[PDB]
Amino acid sequence: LDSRLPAFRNLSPAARLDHIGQLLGLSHDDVSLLANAGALPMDIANGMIENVIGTFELPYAVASNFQINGRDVLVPLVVEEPSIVAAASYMAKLARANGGFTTSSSAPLMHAQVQIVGIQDPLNARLSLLRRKDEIIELANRKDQLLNSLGGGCRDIEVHTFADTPRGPMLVAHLIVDVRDAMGANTVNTMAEAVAPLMEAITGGQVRLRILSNLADLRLARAQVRITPQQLETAEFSGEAVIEGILDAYAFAAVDPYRAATHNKGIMNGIDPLIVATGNDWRAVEAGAHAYACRSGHYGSLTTWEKDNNGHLVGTLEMPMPVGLVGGATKTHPLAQLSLRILGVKTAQALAEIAVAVGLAQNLGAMRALATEGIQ
Amino acid sequence: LDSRLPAFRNLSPAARLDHIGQLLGLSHDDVSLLANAGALPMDIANGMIENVIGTFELPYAVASNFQINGRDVLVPLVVEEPSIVAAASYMAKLARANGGFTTSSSAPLMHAQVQIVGIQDPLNARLSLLRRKDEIIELANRKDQLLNSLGGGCRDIEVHTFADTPRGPMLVAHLIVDVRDAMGANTVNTMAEAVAPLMEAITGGQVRLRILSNLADLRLARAQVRITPQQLETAEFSGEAVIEGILDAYAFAAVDPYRAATHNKGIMNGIDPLIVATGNDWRAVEAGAHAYACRSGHYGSLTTWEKDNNGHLVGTLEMPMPVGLVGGATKTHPLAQLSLRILGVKTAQALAEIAVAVGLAQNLGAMRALATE
Q: B318 and B222 in contact (C-beta within 8 Å)?
A: yes
In the sheet with B52-63, reading across from the earlier edge strand, the strands are A75-78, A52-63, B52-63, B75-78
Give B 140-199 residues with CB within 8 A of chain A.
160, 162, 165-167, 170, 172, 174, 193-194, 196-197
Q: CB contact, 8 Å: A62 with chain B?
A: yes
Q: What is the dihedral of CA A36, A42, A47, A53, to 10 degrees?
A: 120
CB pair distance less than 8 Å for A53 and B165: no
The residues, ordered by sequence, that sit 6+ positions from B200 with a Cβ below 8 Å of its Cβ are A375, B116, B206, B207
Catalytic positions of A are: 81, 265, 281
Q: CB contact, 8 Å: B25 with chain A?
A: no
Q: How far apart are CA B270 and CA B95, in angstroms?
A: 15
* Three-state secondary-structure class, residue A187: helix
Q: CB contact, 8 Å: A296 with chain B?
A: no
Q: CB contact, 8 Å: B258 with chain A?
A: yes
Cα B89–B92–B97 angle (5° rounding)? Answer: 135
Nearest to A359 by CA among A279, A293, A298: A293
Q: How far apart are CA A251 and CA A231, in angstroms?
A: 22
User: B171 has which bridge partners?
Assistant: B116, B161
What is the bridge-based pairing of β-strands B206-212 and A153-162?
A: unpaired
> In this complex, which of A9, A113, A281 lies closest to B81 when CB atoms are compared?
A281
Give contacts of A213 with chain B, Cβ < 8 Å: 258-259, 261-262
Q: How far apart are CA B368 and CA B351, in angstroms?
A: 26
In this structure, what are the phi and psi dihedrals at residue A220, rounded to the nearest 5 degrees?
Answer: -100, 140
Q: How far apart are CA A129 and CA A161, in angstroms?
A: 12
Catalytic positions of B are: 81, 265, 281
Q: A299 and B294 in contact (C-beta within 8 Å)?
A: yes
Give the DSSP H/E element, type plus range, for residue A223. strand A220-227
CB pair distance less than 8 Å for B64 and A84: no
Nearest to A110 by CA among A199, A203, A22, A175: A175
CB pair distance less than 8 Å for A48 and B17: no
Q: Which residue of A has its CA nearest to B163?
A: A255
In the sheet with A303-307, reading across from the earlier edge strand, the strands are A102-105, A220-227, A313-320, A303-307
CB pair distance less than 8 Å for A78 and B57: no
The residues, ordered by sequence, that sit 6+ positions from B40 with a Cβ below 8 Å of its Cβ are A57, A58, A59, B55, B333, B334, B335
Q: A139 and A198 in contact (C-beta within 8 Å)?
A: yes
Q: Determination technique for this PDB entry?
A: X-ray
What is the bridge-based pairing of β-strands B170-178 and B109-117?
A: antiparallel
Q: A296 and B296 in contact (C-beta within 8 Å)?
A: no
Q: CB contact, 8 Å: A51 with chain B?
A: yes
For A44, other C-beta atoms within 10 Å of its C-beta total 17
Q: Which domains does chain A have, with CATH numbers?
A: 2-106+219-373 (3.90.770.10), 109-218 (3.30.70.420)
Q: Which residue of B has its CA nearest to A293?
A: B291
Q: How far apart are CA A58 and CA A36, in angstroms?
A: 14
In the sheet with A170-178, reading across from the earlier edge strand, the strands are A153-162, A170-178, A109-117, A206-212
Nearest to B253 by CA among B208, B207, B311, B298: B298
Give contacts of B45 with chain A, Cβ < 8 Å: 13, 57-60
Q: How far apart are CA B163 and CA B169, in angstroms?
A: 4
Q: How far apart are CA B143 and CA B197, in angstroms?
A: 13
The residues, ordered by sequence, that sit 6+ positions from A3 with a Cβ below 8 Å of its Cβ are A23, A64, A65, A66, A67, A72, A73, A74, A92
In this structure, what are the phi and psi dihedrals at residue B27, rounded to the nearest 5 degrees?
Answer: -70, 160
Nearest to A76 by CA among A63, A58, A93, A92: A63
The DSSP string of A300-368 is: --SEEEEE-TTS-EEEEEEEE----SSSHHHHH-HHHHHHHHHHT-SSHHHHHHHHHHHHHHHHHHHHH
CA distances from A293 to A213, A304, A323, B250 (A): 16, 12, 18, 22
Give contacts of A3 with chain B, Cβ < 8 Å: none
Q: CB contact, 8 Å: A226 with chain B?
A: no
Q: How far apart are CA A325 and CA A182, in angstroms?
A: 6
B295 CB burial (10 A radius; 0-12, 13-18, 19+):
middle
Helix axes A28-35, A13-24, angle to 10 degrees: 160
Q: How far apart are CA A155 and CA A174, in angstroms?
A: 11
SS3 track for chain B: CCCCCCCHHHCCHHHHHHHHHHHHCCCHHHHHHHHCCCCCCHHHHHHHCCCEEEEEEEEEEEECCCEECCEECCEEEECCCCCHHHHHHHHHHHHHCCCCEEEEECCCEEEEEEEEECCCCHHHHHHHHHHCHHHHHHHHHHCCHHHHHCCCEEEEEEEEEECCCCCCCEEEEEEEEECCCECCHHHHHHHHHHHHHHHHHHHCCEEEEEEECCCCCCCEEEEEEEECHHHHCCCCCCHHHHHHHHHHHHHHHHHCHHHHHHHHHHHHHHHHHHHHHCCCCHHHHHHHHHHHHCCCCCCCCCEEEEECCCCCEEEEEEEECCCCCECCCCCCCHHHHHHHHHHCCCCHHHHHHHHHHHHHHHHHHHHHHHHHC
The residues, ordered by sequence, that sit 6+ positions from B182 with a Cβ below 8 Å of its Cβ are B108, B324, B326, B327, B348
Give contacts of B298 with chain A, Cβ < 8 Å: 297
Q: How far apart are CA A311 and CA A314, in angstroms?
A: 9
> In this complex, which of A167, A255, A298 lies closest to B251 when CB atoms are compared?
A167
Q: Which of A32, A49, A56 to mutate to test the interface with B (most CBs of B within 10 A)?
A: A56
Query: Side chain identity at A268, as an amino acid letter?
Result: M
